[PDB]
A paper describes a structure:
Cocrystals of 100–200 µm dimension and diverse morphology grew within hours to days in a broad range of conditions. Irrespective of the precipitant or the crystallization pH, all crystals were the same in the trigonal space group H32. The Gly33 carbonyl group is within hydrogen bond distance of four phenols, while Val13 forms CH−π interactions with a single phenolphosphonate. Lys34 is a linchpin residue (115 Å2 buried) entrapped by a phenolphosphonate pair. Structural differences in the interchangeable linkers result in different relative orientations of the protein nodes in the two structures, yielding different crystal symmetries.
Residue numbers in the entry: 1 to 90
The structure:
């Protein structure tokens, strides 16, 4: 039905990342001050949340993608999206 989004931002320009879960696929749109464009993130999920932090000038992003009761963490640390160590509790 209705897509579900999550958003994060950093800096002062700023940079913004908006993740949209649509029909089981999460994609990413990006802003760094000069126009929206499509990001590299593509992962399965019906629900999405996100957080990010800076270490100096380097952004680190964590996206939590959920299907059913399984949540997978995806990490951006400058070098492509890698699977994180996040696991659920009992
Ligand atoms: O410069 C765009 C980009 O590299 O920014 C960091 C992450 O949002 C990536 O998915 C995205 O493609
Ligand atoms: O560098 C990746 C990592 O260690 O970053 C911190 C947390 O997001 C962890 O789950 C994740 O595996």
């Amino acid at each position: 039905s209705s897509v579900q989004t999550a958003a994060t931002s950093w800096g002062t320009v700023p940079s913004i990342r908006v993740y949209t879960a649509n029909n089981g696929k999460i994609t990413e749109r990006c802003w760094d001050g000069k126009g929206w464009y499509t990001g590299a993130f593509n992962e399965p999920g019906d629900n999405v949340s996100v957080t990010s932090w800076l270490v100096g000038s380097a952004i680190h992003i964590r996206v939590y993608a959920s299907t059913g009761t399984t949540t997978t963490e995806w990490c951006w640390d400058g070098n492509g999206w890698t699977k994180g160590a996040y696991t659920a509790t009992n």
